[PDB]
Design a protein around this ligand. Structure first.
Ligand SMILES: O=c1nc[nH]c2ccccc12
Ligand SMILES: [Zn+2]
Length: 199
């Protein structure tokens, strides 16, 4: 049930990408191989401690969401947690940690920025063979700053706890959520999957 709901979120949030599959590959669905719940007590406590602080600063509301994250460094994240020190000013919203509500958007980052050179074995961004991993995360957004265009931030805007990138004509196709403190996300589920060749 718990894993069926994670599988459903993974499958149902897939969208057709503007890049025609360049970064993440060509697919309409995934072959979900495994869903593992990450139980890291020290990371969970770091997350809940920050979540309580953010709630107190946001009218007793953490504004928590379950969001996807794609990265070549999922193993390091599950053990050491998210780390803003690995985030640099180059992204659309600057030096933050980025999440998506659409699994296929996070899938574009699994092998690096713009999909990098794809899977290590075949150097294929559309590899249907190699097993990929995504995280489905608990993310504390708190008072989230709504933004449409590029705004290179080092930290959350004054009085805020995150940035939400909203879709716009000359901007984003899909939403994205950005935190600037690693302790504001917990890597709750590790999903192992393949993208599937369209029928
Ligand atoms: O999951 C992500 N991993 C890195 N960059 C992103 C940018 C936007 C939305 C999601 C992501
Ligand atoms: Zn491959």
């Amino acid at each position: 049930k718990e894993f069926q709901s994670v599988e459903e979120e993974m499958q149902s949030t897939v969208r057709e990408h503007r890049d025609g599959g360049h970064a993440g590959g060509i697919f309409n669905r995934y072959n979900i191989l495994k869903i593992q719940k990450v139980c890291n007590k020290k990371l969970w406590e770091r997350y809940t401690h920050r979540r309580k602080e953010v709630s107190e600063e946001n009218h007793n509301h953490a504004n928590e969401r379950m969001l996807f994250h794609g990265s070549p460094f999922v193993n390091a994240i599950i053990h050491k947690g998210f780390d803003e020190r690995h985030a640099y000013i180059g992204g659309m919203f600057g030096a933050g940690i980025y999440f998506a509500e659409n699994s296929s958007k996070s899938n574009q980052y699994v092998y690096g920025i713009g999909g990098g050179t794809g899977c290590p074995v075949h150097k294929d961004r559309s590899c249907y063979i190699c097993h990929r991993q995504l995280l489905f995360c608990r993310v504390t957004l708190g008072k989230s700053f709504l933004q449409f265009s590029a705004m290179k931030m080092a930290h959350s805007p004054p009085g805020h706890h995150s940035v939400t990138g909203r879709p716009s004509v000359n901007g984003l196709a899909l939403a994205e959520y950005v935190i600037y403190r690693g302790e504001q996300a917990y890597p709750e589920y590790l999903i192992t999957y393949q993208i599937m060749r369209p029928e």
